[model samples]
Target chain A: ALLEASHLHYHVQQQALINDVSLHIASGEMVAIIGPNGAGKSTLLRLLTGYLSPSHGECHLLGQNLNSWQPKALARTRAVMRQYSELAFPFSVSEVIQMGRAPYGGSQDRQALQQVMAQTDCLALAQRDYRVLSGGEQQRVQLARVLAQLWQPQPTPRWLFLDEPTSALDLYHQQHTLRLLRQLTRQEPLAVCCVLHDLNLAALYADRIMLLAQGKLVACGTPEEVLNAETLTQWYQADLGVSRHPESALPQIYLRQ
Target chain B: AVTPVALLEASHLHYHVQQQALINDVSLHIASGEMVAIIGPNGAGKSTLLRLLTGYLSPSHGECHLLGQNLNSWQPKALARTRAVMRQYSELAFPFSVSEVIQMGRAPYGGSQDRQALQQVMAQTDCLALAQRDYRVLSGGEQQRVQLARVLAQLWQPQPTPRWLFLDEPTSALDLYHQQHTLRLLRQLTRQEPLAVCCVLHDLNLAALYADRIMLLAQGKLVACGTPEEVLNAETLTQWYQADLGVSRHPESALPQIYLRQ
Candidate 1:
């Protein structure tokens, strides 16, 4: 495995935000962390990405403790896209994407810039002001920026972590973003971890599903094995009907009135 | 038979920013005791149309009427009491508690009844637990729940006339349980009382499951408007959205559910 964690525990203000949680990820796979709000999904992401220190347990990236890695080297191997990013200044979309190249002496690479923008379907918005774009458009631009961070070719696997990357996107963009991520993992030595609120999107695209409830990893397995009616209802506390997709064998969930 | 009363109406609405048209020739109507959902792709003028109808933005052409009077003519205080809107983005950087923020919605009506409405709406939106917490420290989803309570408090009291509620993507940050709960609450309120709802939503499945009517917009135009079954055709939506999508029926009902193809 390229990324590993064991018995992760995070507490703040006398509250256990993440409790005894552990997980791992290897190359060429996409894993989704999904559960109800306030279930520590975002907190767990921060812990895995080395942004938050866990009171107990440890995270190992590329066979070394995450804390031991050099700041610039770690920035090159891993990238994170948060739920919401606030930019106070007026920076063009191209400039925001260019900021990702800071890890490598802040050099300009037009080829890398074009490739990521094309992948995220934001090439037309390259020269536009980031502050003027809609919420969905800004999300696409942010995704392009992170992809640019890990654009250079490397031998070891690179990791991408995203928090609700599709929350503001429309139907077409949502499909495009997930499809792009899945394709990237298959074509390169990459591992993707996302905290998603939509269960169906996770079921449709993820190779593995990690279900969290009350800051614990209650279930983790293939979507087919982890996505059960009784389990989701008990954890989500919503009356929902679970069934299989009409075209495929994957599970599809619906809410009941 | 009596005709359904139109609580809100729009005619040939158009909004232009310099040379570009953000909302073009859109027309719609809402009746009492009905829940209408506006849905479209990104940049399809959903929010612009919402702003125009709510009197936040006046259209360059045409006009909107509320209760048979021009939107511009309604007195601000009376209008606030008659309708309420929950916007998509609301940021309060101050130290106001959740209940304090919800209480602001009662400014239009000043009396001892304001306290009663605050408690009623906070409970209705499941915000009782966070009433004492500071609004600035809550998570995105929790803030959304608080905002819903604030808007509901604006229309808490029942009158002889009908009331209207407008929301812009109220469930964007909510999880599955809250999404279902919020929409179900709106549906019940419209059915049980003389209230009407017109919400802007991105998830087609939610609109199909709960809306009395779904309006599909594309490129600043009203593409389709009808019941969920009538408007949610797979080929039409696929073409308009320009995505490879599929549509299937719900197991318990005839409502259409759209899914993306991998």
Candidate 2:
């Protein structure tokens, strides 16, 4: 397993925010996490990645306790990309991506920057200031930065954690981002764990779907199992209907307004 | 064809920043009791147009008329009683209860602070459950409902008059359930009350499902405006949004539905 969590639980102000849960992601698989708002998807991502210490349970990365890994050593094995926030400092798109190579130092800086920019379609934005890009464009650059962090290979399988990576993207970029993620998992020695709100995207791209509701893993299976009308309607508490994609055969969820 | 009276009208509006025109020669009219949705790509001036239409931003050129009077000429208090505006996000620095935030909408009334109106909007927006909760601690979807309740409380009245509501991406943070509930409530209000709702919705499907008419904006101009079938054809949307998509019909309503296609 690339990453694992056994009976993890977190709390804030004496209240259980993330209940007891356990999960594992293996190499070369794309696992999409789906849930309603405040369903503890992001919270769980933080716990598994060692960004926050789980109040009760433990997280092991590559069979080693997450808390035991040195900060710089852990950087070699995992990367994270979060939702948009104000990056007030002025930095060129290239500068932002190149910064991810800090842990690697000068050894892999130049080659990794070149590779990730092309992988994320960020070459066209080389000279543009990061602040000047549109929301979707900025999002693509951020992905490039995160990928650059794990560009150099290590002995263990790489893990990528993302929170709502495509929330800021449009229809075109949404498809592009997921396709890029799927492509990486197919050939690369990496495992991706993404928090995706769109059920259709998860169904079409994810190898495994993890359904979360009120901080519990309600369902975990292939897209065909987790994305049916019954599961979605029960978890979302909305009048929703599910239909299959005419071309891709993936299940698509639509509101019943 | 018969047309309802215009509740708000913008004629040849142009908002220029330095030399670049953000809103270029946009002319439109919102009639009473109509729900019009604005759809476009990022940086398509949707939010800018909402500000210009709501009398929040003064157009560098042209004018906006509300109730046959210039929007600029109306007193701020007078305008607050007639219309309500809700933007994309609310930055509450202080920890305030949901009811306290909703009651802030009545500031324009001075002495006539109707507690009953606050309760009515809270109930209508499904915010009564969160009334005593801290506004700063709620989730994105929950906060959005409270904001709507506040906006509704702004124009809430014992005696109803024609009203206008301008919302910018109100459903962006809401989940699937609240998205349906919010839009259905707006549709019901437009049909039964003397109100006109003009919202900038990023989700094209929501626009098609809930809006009476869809307004397309591209490169800072109004490109299309009509019923869902008239405006949401694959050709026009593909061109404006620069995306690959297909148009289908809702199985029940037969309205246009947008979907991603390979």
Candidate 3:
């Protein structure tokens, strides 16, 4: 496993954001964190990625405590793509992705940059100003930037953490990005953890799905095990239904209203 | 049966800047009590069309008529009272109470009567609990609700004539419950009041579930417009969107539900 956590609890003032949650991420596995609004999905992701400290419990990355790892070494091992990032200044797409190399002396690697941008479908936007790009376009650039962060050859398994990576993406872009992530995990020593809002996408791409409700892990298993219509209705508090895909064994969810 | 009047109409709408035509020669009309959803790929000018319809941007080469009058001809205050718009993102530099920010919508109505609008809209949007909290401290989903409340407050008064509401991806940051809640509220309001909604929705499923009509735009052109069943065919959607997507029928409503293919 590339990451592990046990009895994780995070609190803000008197409110508990994450409560007694335990999970692990193994190499070549794609895990999805799913929950309703205010269900502490993002908070749990931050704790696992070392962005936020747990109020109680322990998180270990690569057989060592997250708090004890050197910041530079940690940055090189894992890359994070947040839901939204503000870049006020005007910077070309190429320039922005190149900044991802900062943890490794910020050197210019044109070949590596091109590869990540190509994989992300952002090669055509290389010269465009990042500020002027649309929401979906910016999302692609951000994905490319993070890929650049972990692009170099490494013997050990690497990690990628994303929060709502497809929230702003259109249908085609969403399909392309998730497919790329799935393929990467299978071909490379990469562990992927994403906080996803669309339950259908989670059911489609995630190897394991973790369901959260009111700051606690309510269910954890493969998509087949966790994507029950009744269970989702209870957790999400929405009228919904589940149906099997025509071509696959995955259970797809839809709103009842 | 008498047809409802076309309260909002657009003809040959075109918006161009520099060398790019953001919105090209599109035409449509909306009647009272109708819910229309505008959907398209990113940068396909969904927002631009919304801006043109809401009078935020004057069309470069066509006319937008509201209540049989040119959009730009209406007085600003009158226009604000008759229609409201909620953009994709909103920010507040200063820390103001949620109620205070929503009350900003009541500027056109200057009196104690503003209290009723604020309270009703807050309750409708489920923002009553956060009325006292600072708007800046709220999360993205919460902020979106507050903005919806503010716009609702703008058109809160019981109008005898038709009213219009335009929103750009209002449910993007919201969860499943809130998304259903907001769309259902819009549907109920349209049925009960003389109101018409033209919203830009990214999720085709939600649009199909709630919208009376779905308009598909591509490359700044209105490519398709009709009922969800007419527009949401897998062949048409895939041809325009060029994605590996499959459309399945909802188990209950039998409406089209879009799913991404792995």
Candidate 4:
């Protein structure tokens, strides 16, 4: 197992947001947390990434207590991409990405930087200013920077946590990012988890889907089992029609009146 | 064939900013009681076209006519009476009551009737309950509605001229409920009054449902212009946007809805 959380609960301003949620991810597994707005999906992701302490229970990453890992070790093993990231200063796209290497304790060599740039497909925008780019382009550059920060040469199984990574992305970039993640998991013992709002995309990419509602785990299963029309209608309060892709067997949702 | 009562007409309009041509050789005619939508990706000069149409910016090469008069020659009062514009972002630095902000719409009328006009607009926009609320503190959707009320009050006066409304991405910040309601209200209002509306919309499906005609802008030029059925087909959208988008008709209304095949 790559990560495990037991009886995890979180509070914000004396209000319980995540209640007794337990989850585990094995190596090479791609899991998704799906929920409506304000369902604590982002809160759970933050807690699992060790950005915030759980109000109750414990979180274990790589068979070690989450709190015991040093900041540098955590940086080497996991990388998190948040939904909304703002910069106070105007920086070039490459400069902003360079900051991602700070947790590694030294400047990245030319070859490593080149590898990251190639992997994230942001080499063309290396010298361009980040603030001048459109929202979707900026998102892609930020995603590349995160991937660069987490790139390891020794090939240890790594983990990635993303919050709504596809929100600012267009259809092409969305597929590109998901395909890159899927490739990484297949080639390495990587465990990836993301908070996804679009159910169809989640079904297409995620190996497992976890549904959350009102701070509790509602369903956790394969795409076919979890993303059925009945489950989507019950959780989203909207009628949805489900169809399967002939090529990939992924579930697709259409809105029904 | 009936002759168009050209409420607004742009002839060979061109706009250049800092040595870059933002709009190049664009000419279009908007008739009264017509609903038109401008659809494009970001930085495609959709907003610039709206600003030019509303007389906020002068075109470099061509003339814009409103009600058979040159838009550039119209006085501020005449312009206010004939046209109203709703921008993507409203700059409200000072705190004021919603009603007070709405009453500013009647500045062109310039009389004691402002209060009555404000009340009528409030009732029409369903904003009477929020009349006393601070405009700056309202939610994004609420503020959008309030701004719409202000535009209605400005253009729909006692002696209403054949008015034009230019809306730039008006539904960008609204939720599903507000978006649906606003589009429905716009459709109804245009039918009830002699109004011409041009809006830049992000969601293509909503535009198909609401607009009588759809215009696609790519790289500062008009690429396609036609009815929703003509412009919203899968092939044109896929080629223009460079994505694998699935276009299907809504089951109940038979309007086109764009979906992505991932």
| Candidate of highest DockQ | 3
Interface RMSD of candidate number 3? 2.0
The CA lDDT at B184 in model 3 is: 89
Worst 10 residues of 1 chain B by lDDT: B170-179
Q: Kindly provide the TM-score of model 3 when superposed on the true structure, using C-alpha atoms.
A: 0.81
Looking at candidate 3, what is the lDDT of residue A14? 78
Error of 2 at A250 (Å): 0.5
Model 1 ranges off by over 4 Å: A50-54, A62-64, A67-156, B1-7, B55-59, B66-82, B88-160, B242-244
Write the candidate numbers in order of decreasing DockQ.
3, 1, 2, 4
Worst 10 residues of 3 chain A by lDDT: A166-175
The C-alpha interface RMSD of every prediction is 2.2, 2.3, 2.0, 4.3
lDDT of 3 by residue, A1-257 (tens): 56999899999987888888999999899999998878889899999999898887999999999999998989889999874768899899999999887788755577779889988888899999988998778878998999999887655688999886645566566666777899999998999899887788899999999998889999999998999987987876778888888657898887877
Fnat for each model: 0.48, 0.42, 0.71, 0.10
lDDT score, candidate 3: 0.85
Kindly report the interface RMSD of candidate 2, rounded to 1 decimal: 2.3
TM-score of chain A of each: 0.95, 0.94, 0.95, 0.93
Query: TM-scores across all candidates?
Result: 0.81, 0.85, 0.81, 0.87
lDDT digits (tens) for residues B1-262 of candidate 2 = 9864757989988998888999898999888899999889887899889989999899887999999999989999889988899864878889899989989988788747468888788988888889898888998778878988989999787775898988887545566667667788989999988889999888888899889988898878999989989999888877877666777767556887777764
lDDT of 2 by residue, A1-257 (tens): 65888988988887778888888999899998998877889998898889999887999988899989999979978999875856798888899888888778678688888889988888999998888998778778888988999887554579988887545567677677777888888888889899888887788779999998877889988888889998887887778788766566677677676
Q: Runs in model 4 with CA error above 4 Å?
A: A83-99, A102-111, A127-137, A165-172, A198-200, A219-257, B1-6, B112-116, B158-161, B170-173
